[PDB]
Structures are given as C-alpha cells and as structure tokens.
Amino acid sequence: AGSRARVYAEVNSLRSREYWDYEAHVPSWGNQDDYQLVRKLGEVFEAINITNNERVVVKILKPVKKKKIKREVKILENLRGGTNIIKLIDTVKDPVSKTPALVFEYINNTDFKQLYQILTDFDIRFYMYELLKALDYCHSKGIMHRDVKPHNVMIDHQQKKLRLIDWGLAEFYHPAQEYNVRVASRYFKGPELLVDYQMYDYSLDMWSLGCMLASMIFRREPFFHGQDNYDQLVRIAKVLGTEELYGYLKKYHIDLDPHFNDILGQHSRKRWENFIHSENRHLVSPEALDLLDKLLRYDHQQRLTAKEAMEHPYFYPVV
Ligand SMILES: O=C(O)c1cccnc1
C-alpha cells in the first residue's frame, strides 16, 4: 500500500478544494511597470517599487508554462505570513510582453560558500532551527518544498535572518499520490528519488535538510557528492551501507535498477563519528550526530518530522 506521511497526512483533504487545486487558481496580474529592475540579484533582479521607492526582488517567470506558474503562485499565497518563508508581495506582468513575474521581499544574502566557513556550533543550530520553522510550516500547510539546498536558503548573517526561497518545485502532498522523482537538486535528492519511488512525502525535505546539516557540521560541502543520479545513490550507500539500502528496498517493495548492480559495490554502514577530524571537531557533538542519524536514514517514513527535529536536544541552546 506504499507509504504515507506520519504527519499532516490528510490536511489538504480537510481544506477547501480551492486551497490545493492550483490549476483552478486565477492570479491577479498587476502592472510590472510599477517596478524599476535595477540590477541582477547577486533571472532575479533587485528592483525598486516606483511608488514608494521600496527595494524588492523581482523573479521573471517563464510565460509558456501556465501550470507551474499557477502552482508556484498558489503555494506562495497559501504560505504567506509563514515563518521564514520568503514573502510574495505581488504578482505582475510586463505590459508589453505579458510575461509574468513575481515580486518578493528583499533579503541581503551572504554567499553560503563563505558563510558556512565562519559559522559556529551555535550558529548552525540557530539557522537549522530557523529553517525547520519554515519546513514545519509549509508541511503543516500541506506543501513539500522539494528543493531544499543552501542556494535556496537565504541568510543575512548581519541581521540573523533566514528565508526559504524558490518554491517553483514545491507540490501539495496528498496521501498515495505519485510524484515526479526528477525534483530537488542532485546532492540533496533523498534515496527514494534515486530509486524511482514516487509515493514520497514531506520527509523528502527532511533528508535534504539533513544533507545540509551534515555539510555544515562536517565541512564537506556537498556531503554526498554524486557525479550523476546513479552515482549519487552510490555516494549515499558508501555511508549508509549497501545491505542497509537493500533492506530499505525490500521493505517498500522497490526493485533496484539493474544498472546499479555493477556500480553499487559492497559497503559497510559508517558510524557518523568517522567523519570527524581536526578541521570540524569544534562543530560536531554527540547531539549533532544523533540528530543527523535520525535525518539521513533510508527509510523516509522513519526520518524525524520537522517538528520532531525541533524537539531534539541539539536545538536546546536555541529554543
Ligand atoms: O526564487 C525565489 O523564490 C526567490 C529568489 C530570490 C529572492 N527571492 C525569492
């Protein structure tokens, strides 16, 4: 009977159909002439609202779509006011091209490739906890982000502000729904996507969060560095173990692609303590590893929910 989410499983069915039927959504498209598109945001531009000189972000959409446009707008409107969710301010079209764009609150991002090098133990806990606030909220709202990765987590370290951005791959969760496994970005794809298992849920985002946690406390970014989707499962199983992978597959009646038979090899399950060395020892703790172990596990249904992760001792200093 496949699997279902342990939490927020039925919350979309309990809501008005208009909430999740994004194909029926009809956005109110404003005039993009209200916006002065000043610079590329270091197809997203920094812009100034001509009316009130307030700075914003404008993201230009792809006009030929329709379906993914209605889906991203609807999810963003549903998530408005959500904790650490990037705030959609307006939906507009260029008056000449009719091309849709989205207007977002401005956030001064610090490139994660520099930021992560000066984060302390406290910082990582702090920001992971902020990120969890966002994920618990969108999952409570019946939405999987499906593309959690450092590039989609904007952080202003001066102001200690975090925002989960780019909801273009987000979907509504409905129990027993089969989804596209070509979602997320390679390094952060959960094992369920890599073995063509389509009945996944919110716990896909928790695997990606776990990937981020691992790279921050261990200083190996990305942590699972696949060269393609096939090799990505290989990198994971070099850590979580190959016999452990087969167990997972056995449990959910998943048959592994015959291509894997020649490249998977045989690998033992590594203890997380094996990734500790002098260069990350000040970021790692037993509480960090015990949390990580409960996120990066094959069995999506057994992974901690965002809410459970928030209750973990690792965030005791930031609650
Ligand atoms: O894609 C987005 O949602 C996005 C990108 C940059 C800034 N604000 C939002």
What SS3 string covers 85-132?
ECCEEEEEECCCCCCEEEEEECCCCCCHHHHCCCCCHHHHHHHHHHHH
> Burial of 284 by CB count in 10 Å (0-12 exposed, 13-18 middle, 19+ buried)?
buried
Structure tokens at 60: 């230009």
- C-alpha distance across the termini of the chain, in Å: 38
Alpha carbon distance 298, 289 (integer Å): 16
Under 8 Å CB-to-CB from 64, ≥6 apart: which residues?
none
Cα 49 to Cα 60, 154, 169, distances in angstroms: 15, 21, 27
239 CB contacts (<8 Å, ≥6 apart)?
A: 224, 267, 269, 270, 296
User: Which H or E run includes 238?
Assistant: helix 229-240
Tell me the CA distances in angstroms from 47 to 51, 58, 179, 256, one per residue in order: 12, 6, 35, 48
Domain 3-20+107-319 fold is Transferase(Phosphotransferase); domain 1 (1.10.510)
**CA-nearest residue, atom 3 of ligand 1:** 166
Asked whether 78 and 140 are in contact (CB, 8 A), the reply is no
- Cβ distance 55 to 37 under 8 Å? no
Pocket test for ligand 1, best of 75, 105, 154, 185 (most atoms within 8 A of CB): 154
Is 21-106 in CATH node 3.30.200.20?
A: yes
Q: Which helix (H) or strand (E) holds 251?
A: helix 242-251
* 8 Å CB contact between 136 and 148: no
Residue 241, classed as helix, strand or coil, is coil
CA distance 221 to 213: 10
Please indicate whether residue 166 is annotated as part of the active site: no
Residue 162 and residue 154 in contact, taking contact as beta carbons nearer than 8 Å: yes
43 annotated to bind ligand? yes
Q: Which residues contact 304 (CB under 8 A, 6 or more apart)?
A: 206, 291, 294, 295, 312
Q: Where in the chain is the domain with CATH 1.10.510.10?
A: 3-20+107-319
Q: How far is CA 88 from the centre of its chain?
A: 18
How far apart (Å, rounded) are the C-alpha atoms in residues 313 and 128? 13
Quick check: 300 and 190 in contact, CB under 8 A?
A: yes
Which among 147, 166, 201, 205 is annotated as catalytic?
147
Residue 161 counted as an annotated binding residue:
no
Specify the domain boundaries for CATH 3.30.200.20 within the chain. Answer: 21-106
What DSSP state is assigned to residue 151?
A: G
Mutation choice for ligand 1 from 87, 105, 166, 185, CB with most ligand atoms inside 8 A? 166
| Three-state DSSP state, 37 | strand
Q: Is residue 59 marked as binding?
A: yes
